[model samples]
Target chain A: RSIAQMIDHTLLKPNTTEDQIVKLCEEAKEYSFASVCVNPTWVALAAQLLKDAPDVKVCTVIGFPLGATTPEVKAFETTNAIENGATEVDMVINIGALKDKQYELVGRDIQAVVKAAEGKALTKVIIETSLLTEEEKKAACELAVKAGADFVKTSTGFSGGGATAEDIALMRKVVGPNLGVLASGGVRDLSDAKAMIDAGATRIGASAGVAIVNGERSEGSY
Target chain B: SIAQMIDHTLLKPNTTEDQIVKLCEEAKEYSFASVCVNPTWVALAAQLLKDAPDVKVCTVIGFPLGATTPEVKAFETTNAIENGATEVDMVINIGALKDKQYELVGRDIQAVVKAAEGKALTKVIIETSLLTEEEKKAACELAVKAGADFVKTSTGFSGGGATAEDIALMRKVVGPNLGVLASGGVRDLSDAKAMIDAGATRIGASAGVAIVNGER
Candidate 1:
């Protein structure tokens, strides 16, 4: 399905290797997917592998799925990855801080990553939707926008849950035409893919990009 | 000179009952402020220090890693104090702190503080080893606002040990009224003296025996 083109072929599992990443890049190339996301350590490798296929962007993670790292570290991670040829960086908002009701710190953390991405890369903020209350989800979108994120992402996949149509719609509504929205975490199949896109996800982050495209065709249209 | 104000600890996982007994006897012999033990040995250590009027009992709560639930830490504080700890040190939830969840961090401290509740002196362990100078000061600000009696640096578990820089930062945050306990990698008389000079009112170390013996 052409929809696979919107997926960021992702491999964030910690034990993933350079060889695995090279293979992943090869698959992304074959599929003509949007981007291939890897952990920061693999960013340079992914970049090199995807170099000739400029259409396949290299995305890297900062602060990662949990978002517990300090803003300072996340900023450094962002700048480092961008310097290594990453076109996109996904950083986790300090969710513990966000849940603690320190909105400015959360906003500042996101802003720090956004500033690090300036001049070189686009930035996405992972909101870790499983842990957020409805209010938190809305605030996360607003904060990501205020912090100059290019996209608002839902879930990290490490958590028990994944993206939801309702959450994506909420992010799109709160971002309100200014930023992109990414739906990640546990995207298994085509309807899962279509539901999120239909709900306004501009990017889908999934390890199951091929499966999701395959899933869309066999089912009756809902 | 401040040997009487030290908490002599030996909580290494392999540390045995014999080691704790030796630690207590040496503590009593040196007139230490208290003999610090891990929670598993708190009651026994307290019994050892029970009649030693010069020494009280102290223990840790939610230590090393402060990522446990707030209620869990509070219960730990209550249990330690009830078992004979006159003083209790607790770690600030590091994840919460990193997340800028200042209020939650404050509440985490307060839960332990309230659990200690006039029975024991509460030390909010900032574990400065993991904090930047700015983060160190921020944790202290929250500790003070939380009404914790002390701001301690380090669990001796992180990659970084305590530094004069961390002590100075903590001192700057806590001011004159609250105690500042300098811990982690503190050894020798000069280390104790230096920390005190930097505004540490209490010292947490297993090196108390060495510091005092070396002092003599």
Candidate 2:
């Protein structure tokens, strides 16, 4: 779908500096993307830089890369980021904790962030499919819904793999139609974008938002 | 007062009676919380700690791994509490939680909590390294919901070290209604402070004395 233009443009390198984020915002604006996703530290700056152009969204991460941080910290991070002007939150779930069957911890972890983000920001929980079994995925989606998350995302893209059709279909089955299902990472062009949408994704998150929109084939392996 | 909260451990299978006696003496001299001895030595530690009114008597239930049946753990808890353990730290049914058996895990904690009722303080060991965010929340929620007074982060047996981040998560979930204990990876006073800032109200460390002195 040409709707890949609505993707959340993201860059989450550890050593990333201000100038890089500025360029990240530039790409979002230049491509008319839905949002520019950055780490929490850059939310205020991104919000400020993109304020005049409110049409573009400013998203930030919580408990990033690894969702191992305490729920309170993630919640505080969410509230703090939103107070500073974040429009969306892509939260990483505590993988080790989740895999250990600490469902309540994972659930409340998401819920705390959701509660903190209730009115001002949208919360997208990352349940990296590569690491979870189908049941794990279903449970995660169920927990996300219970916690009142706005979206259930695929991967953080920092992992071994990205979105899979089977995972999307399963998540769609679990999340149903109402809650947003974002097919992120590695989704490159129109065919893959269409495939993700066909698999029931409501939104696409990719760095190739430009190529996908221009009807051109994307290059390189994500 | 700080020493009164210390819990000297000897979980190693080869621990001897002399070691237990030494541990008890240290508990007496420093007024440490309790000496967590092997199950075989519970009677001795009970007799030892009973003399220290200021020091609590503690023992583990469903220890090392929380996968044991609740029936077995419950009996162990009942027996320990009956023997004179004033505080109990039981492992949650971690396997059940991973299986999406929140009710089962809760019930497991409940069984031990109920067994320890009136006779002892119950803190559920969550083994943070093994849980996902949902499971961690569920574990704490279940522990509190099941009558546990404290939600502990680890048994020092799981993958990953205990972190301020994990403690913060637990603290937020437990809130003011329950207590959050930071365990594992807590080797120094700075680690303790970080966990406190992250939301841990209590701490579980194998090296409490070292931690207290490290801040200086």
Candidate 3:
């Protein structure tokens, strides 16, 4: 119910340092945010740091900003992340496959990751709405639901665009009320967070979690 | 061995099926060492290059950014090989290496190397553009320690590309037993020649046609 509880405090920069990850976990605990979303390599460290804060989960990305990897690889990534203590896994969909009309491949890709993290972690499928057509976005959400994904997420931020209220509403419309809709990428402030929530986003993924919680706008790319 | 040393590449995110067909055609015409593409295109590239046994199919894992776990990269290597990639170019965890997580860095390369084993040759891309001189040397050392067949510079997607200086430094660190691959910004024959002279055993470039034609 609290905005902080809906946020996945994130730091996924390629150049992120250990100190930065530690500080991120500390801040997540201090703010009582939902989770500390990090890259795969930092999952173990994040889990270790957040050991005492059981309420704060450790989350990581699979196939990352580019979902071009094979289904087996993404599944392996999910399994590994969960083994390393991540309770939440956000995976990019096979965007090219989806665009190329390979719906089966895209569905199977998400299915593999979902199956791998079945009991261990919740799987969120990032459709990268910025690069897709409206039709494509709906198709992606349908495939995620078909593949048993727990959540349908908007963007990876590495792509040119971020989350928008319009896209969030579209995703929520497609997934309906059962699945979670995560607005990631550019949710920087309290207003932005509230806008996404009002538009049907059940989760907010951002690097500016502290700023948003403190009711201040921050300038940082996810 | 100029053409043979080159891995004609098209790893751009927006690359289409038609472009992959053209890439395979160019690689066949130039007799390049490999046609390096993203994982998604490996199967198609392999199919296109099926008859051309001289040219291999290569794909990248962990790619321009290497923040993924070792298990993920290892599985990527295995899956790429299954899709017919004969060579795997994987990016090392730059942040981990910079964090002095040397063991993790070594294990990351080792995982891919182990997966590739006899199926494919493994090249570690350290993304030299983001590393200091010490980190670069340390990365090269880790590649050798991890049994990687080659140590590569840059992933053109990163801000910096291959430099003769970095190639030379990598060569010095890895020694003659292992290959040094100069990737990223190798545009023409002269640049390729410079990298080769500085101790690059392989070259990765998108301009293979022009390079083989001796054009700048």
> Per candidate, chain B TM-score?
0.96, 0.90, 0.97
- Which candidate number maximizes TM-score? 3
- What C-alpha lDDT, on a 0 to 100 scale, does residue A48 get in candidate 3? 96
In model 3, state the lDDT of residue A63.
85
Worst 10 residues of 3 chain B by lDDT: B10-19
Candidate 3 lDDT by residue in tens digits, A1-222: 467889999998887889999999999999899999999989999999999999999999988887887888888888888989999999999887887888999999999999999988999999998889999999999999999999999999888888999999999999998789999988878999999999999999998888887773243334
- DockQ in order: 0.03, 0.02, 0.64
Candidate 1 chain B minimal-lDDT segment of 10 residues: B63-72
lDDT of 2 by residue, A1-222 (tens): 347355888776533456777888887787778899876656777898898877788888775554543465567667777887898988877665566677897798899899988888899999988778788899999999989999999998866689988889999999897689999888987788789888988878887677777774344334
* lDDT by residue (tens digit), candidate 2, B1-216: 344444565554334456667777776776666676544457667787666777666677756556444655677677777667777788776656766767877788888888888888888888888777887888888887898888888776556666877888888888898877777777777777787778877666667667656545
Full ranking by TM-score? 3, 1, 2
Off by over 4 Å in 3: A216-222, B188-190, B213-216
The Cα RMSD across the true interface for model 2 is 19.4
- Per-residue lDDT, model 2, residue B185, is 76
lDDT digits (tens) for residues B35-64 of candidate 3: 998898899998998999999999998976
Arrange candidates by DockQ, highest first: which order?
3, 1, 2
Model 2 segments beyond 4 Å from truth? A216-222, B1-216
Candidate 1 interface RMSD to the true structure: 16.6
